[PDB]
Symmetry: C4
Subunit: 277 residues, 4 copies
């Protein structure tokens, strides 16, 4: 390795925020989630649940109109911007959000990139995932840009083939976080969290129960919510990745690692988070 | 303070109603919930669940047609008045209800105010929340009118800015309950329950887990149901606010306060209510 | 009273059927449930769940087309006869069913009565509930006809006002079961189960948690399923009514009687039924 | 008998795969499920849940367009091929899958057979169930073909009447697995798993709780998922059938065998599978 340190339980315990008696939901902010399309609807539910579970005050889901009815019965606490991810291709966000995520369940299209460009003119942290991940550069702005690639997405972004990436994961994550001036959460066993200021950590939690469709959609939502309740966005990303993996570890105490469904990570998070308080 | 007393556990225990062996659902009344729009559907599910959980006999949900399918799989016990909140703008209620709530998930429009005006000609308690909260006066009628503003809604109603309101919450709640001749449930930590006869209490339960979208929608439903099973509507409002907060406190025994979803308050209420019996 | 005996735990234990190792789902029959309309959809979900929980082999739900999508995510084990309750107004059932129920969530219309007339030409037990309950007579047929009126429905059927009915419930139930030559399950505390052969029992289970919308829809489904797995339809009706009430009693051990939702009765039935085996 | 051996717990324990720390979801493959039609939608949800529960990496559900919204809220981890089972009638699969299942909730039509013919040109294991089961032969190909008939389906396939089949189940299953050169999972108590190479086993698990609509749909999904995580497809089929039955046995420890709903088998599988690890 390059001796990248693990973000450990001690670090998590020291950095997780309080929800004090005097707070109101405004204290914890409104998040925007731009996710889910008619063709890939479930991602929006997975990210929505992860976000509302993770300490935000309010969530607006800008999903395709036909996806909205699929979310409501499961997550009636979310509100909507009808066809929001499409509308965001055409104009600047008018509303102020605490944090924004774009990409889960979105196609890898130019229109999604147009939406990204408009999202990036906001002054808040922004997460790009999935369909929003492309080979491109980023404008100087206020607020971190957080990319959350699977190794195959990292290849799409950089041209580094997966078989080579996997030999030197932190080295590549660090190099590209620096070059792009973005946070890179390079997924996998020992997920790398590389920051554009050159800080970098490894995540010590998780297991093979996570190697199934949807678990990254859940993670994007987790990061989104934690960006709303942490003052330091670096700590939000680190804690989200950590607690996401910790949920999978709790699952495998009494359940087979073959059998986890992503949404259950959100259902487990309430008890797992308590343990670190 | 003004030494406003807390509505304590002792008061709750002394005032919660029995559901005796000889009762039928008619004993507990039919409630009407005018809530949920295509743009804000989840509020109707949240309030519906809170209402059916809270001791009513039957619930009619007057929600937008497209919202009905989103409620049914979760709350198949509810019945419907298709587009009821819209229809209520145009004519008097023909049916007799035990209690009525209007506003969760409704827009802040003149048409919603027209619906309010028609709701107020019924002889039963009425709850106004959310979109139904405006700067206006109320007609002399039979049955209490119960307003449930968040501080921002209170500002909309009165012109008292939130930063000033928060310095003297009970004083302002009492003054405006008197002026409007309505019950005011002024939300927040230490929620104020101010009555138009000058009685006023503070609620001692709850915590920051409640500072998230949807929890007030759940509360409106709780108050609606409790108005159906309490003979004294004052006690219904007080017990609803109390038990709502108590559910959040049970949650935080083994779950992080960051992670509560409003609908879970309704799922917790069955066991919490038992404890006070 | 008239000293009508209670159908006791001892009777239930002696009459509940086995599900032996050598059985196949055909042994337990296909039930037809004609229930749910666009205006009252939830009844079909409630009765569907109660029926599939109660020992049948297969369930066909003949509900309105727009109701089908509301059932599937909750009860994916059911199959459908699209617009079946409407189609049944126009022709004889072609398929053979083990048992049929009609009425939950159906309007009190002539077309529903036409459907009833066609249902009654089948040779199997038939349950009429809700919208299918009217002032009418019944044709001599093979298989019992089981009416499940609430006292208000009994008034509609017979002209006996509810305040008079309630003074002499068994006497009236027996008289009308005899006159109509139908089973009458006259609902309420101490539900009466009156048979056209003059046998009559009282149900000893249940409590005020049941005095809420939907619980009778659940019961109709329970009776439907139990008619499929009991050889003796009398025992099916008696056991269904008993175990339905027993579920409410289990609920109130740790939950307030004000807070039960009907569908939960079906969720409780698996464990309650085990106790009587 | 013919002394066909039971696939025992010892065999299951020796053959169930690990999900190691270094794995990614690609290791576990993408499955295709061609299931569910407007008329029989629930089968697709049941098989989808069983498949995602059973160790695959990703699931694509090729179901009718109107069925997709019914799956998403329950199984947001699945992705879709809109009208896939219909489209498969018209062209070869372009995408590579680890395993494919076709038939649950599909009609017994020529178009479904056309889809089968195209599925069979893939090089992967394929499961045919329900509507995909017909009297026909199979082309020489790479990858096993796995037929999962109920006795009535076996009759449809072979002309052997059910009353005769049931007297000599293994003998008939073996003879027809050989003749067709397919795996035959002949369902029932003591389900027969007959292989075209002449190997044959009996399944020792399960009980009458399984004799209800939907449980076979769940099984098809289980086999589909296990084909993705086992290197040996024979062991996948055997373990799926075994663990499916084991879930029903866990259910009946504290719940009546009359009351199981198929989807619950998938909910039980996580804990049951752990026990065999
Ligand atoms: N305290 C810290 N905070 C954030 N990131 C840190 C850190 N310490 C190390 N890192 C990251 O880890 C990378 C590697 O650490 P280095 O300490 O540069 O690792 P090394 O080259 O292998 O030297 P060492 O001696 O530790 O053996 C750094 O470049 C940085 O990105
Ligand atoms: N060579 C290639 N191989 C594969 N894909 C390629 C590719 N080349 C291009 N691609 C592609 O890149 C994309 C891969 O995404 P997909 O693999 O298609 O992702 P998905 O099913 O949509 O799931 P999701 O997005 O929820 O999970 P994620 O991986 O984010 O999140 C997974 C989560 O689980 C965690 N996780 C997984 N395995 C783990 C383990 N063993 N230990 C600990 N954590 C683990 C991860 O760290 C993370 O948090 C596709 O567009 C695609 O076609
Ligand atoms: N028994 C009661 N029932 C209902 N409301 C009550 C009450 N006692 C007090 N309140 C409410 O609380 C308000 C303040 O109580 P006060 O008792 O008027 O409070 P104070 O002005 O601070 O005097 P104290 O002496 O208690 O110190 C009252 O105006 C009334 O609104
Ligand atoms: N300056 C301003 N700030 C904010 N909004 C402004 C504003 N000016 C105008 N507004 C506005 O006023 C409205 C505020 O509503 P929103 O804040 O938009 O409400 P919501 O997300 O729709 O949630 P809900 O209605 O379910 O929760 P509620 O607060 O009723 O219910 C919350 C429940 O949780 C309880 N709760 C919250 N925090 C608690 C705590 N710390 N302790 C105990 N209980 C707590 C409350 O008492 C209550 O029961 C908006 O229309 C709006 O734009
Ligand atoms: N063994 C049995 N099986 C079924 N129904 C029975 C029954 N015994 C009594 N009943 C029902 O209960 C009704 C009343 O029972 P009866 O025994 O006729 O009651 P009674 O007139 O009050 O006389 P008793 O002496 O018991 O005092 C009967 O008409 C019959 O409908
Ligand atoms: N004077 C009048 N009063 C009322 N309605 C009148 C009326 N005159 C005419 N009507 C009418 O008659 C109908 C009454 O039905 P509704 O009262 O409208 O029934 P629902 O909300 O649709 O619920 P459901 O059908 O699921 O419950 P049910 O009562 O079957 O099932 C309830 C279940 O709970 C049980 N239950 C209820 N209370 C119980 C208790 N205290 N103890 C034990 N069990 C109890 C019952 O035995 C039964 O199993 C309406 O059409 C109507 O307008
Ligand atoms: N080790 C094995 N692996 C897979 N299949 C097996 C097997 N042993 C037996 N079978 C299957 O079971 C069938 C019957 O076994 P046989 O052993 O042929 O049974 P039998 O004719 O009754 O003779 P036995 O002596 O056991 O008494 C075989 O034809 C084969 O299909
Ligand atoms: N004479 C005839 N009798 C019946 N049908 C006939 C027939 N002639 C033709 N048919 C027909 O054949 C088909 C029978 O299917 P259906 O019986 O209509 O099946 P389904 O309701 O759609 O349920 P599913 O498909 O989920 O359950 P399956 O049986 O696969 O899966 C059931 C699962 O439960 C297990 N199981 C059942 N009973 C068990 C027991 N007692 N012990 C252990 N396991 C048991 C099975 O092994 C299996 O895993 C129909 O098309 C049909 O019309
Ligand atoms: Cl708040
Ligand atoms: Cl009642
Ligand atoms: Cl069967
Ligand atoms: Cl992965
Ligand atoms: Mg991803
Ligand atoms: Mg509110
Ligand atoms: Mg009824
Ligand atoms: Mg089948």
């Amino acid at each position: 390795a390059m001796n990248v340190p693990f973000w450990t339980e001690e670090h998590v315990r020291a950095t997780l925020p309080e929800r004090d008696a005097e707070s109101h939901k405004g204290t914890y902010g409104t998040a925007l989630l731009l996710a889910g399309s008619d063709d890939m609807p479930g991602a929006a539910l997975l990210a929505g649940l992860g976000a509302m579970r993770s300490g935000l005050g309010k969530l607006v889901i800008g999903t395709s109109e036909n996806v909205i009815p699929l979310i409501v019965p499961v997550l009636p606490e979310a509100t909507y911007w009808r066809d929001g991810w499409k509308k965001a291709a055409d104009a600047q966000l008018e509303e102020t959000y605490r944090a924004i995520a774009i990409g889960p369940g979105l196609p890898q299209t130019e229109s999604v990139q147009q939406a990204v460009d408009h999202v990036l003119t906001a002054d808040c942290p922004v997460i790009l995932d999935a369909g929003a991940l492309a080979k491109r550069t980023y404008p100087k702005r206020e607020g971190p840009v957080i990319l959350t690639p699977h190794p195959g997405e990292f290849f799409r972004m950089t041209g580094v083939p997966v078989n080579e990436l996997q030999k030197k994961r932190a080295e590549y994550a660090k190099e590209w976080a620096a070059q792009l001036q973005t946070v890179i959460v390079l997924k996998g066993n020992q997920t790398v969290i590389a920051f554009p200021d050159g800080d970098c950590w490894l995540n010590p939690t998780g297991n093979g129960a996570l190697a199934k469709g949807g678990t990254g959609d859940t993670l994007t939502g987790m990061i989104l919510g934690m960006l709303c309740c942490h003052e330091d966005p670096k700590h939000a990303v680190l804690n989200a990745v950590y607690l996401h993996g910790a949920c999978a570890e709790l699952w495998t105490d009494e359940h087979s690692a073959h059998t986890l469904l992503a949404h259950e990570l959100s259902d487990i998070l309430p008890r797992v988070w308590k343990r670190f308080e």
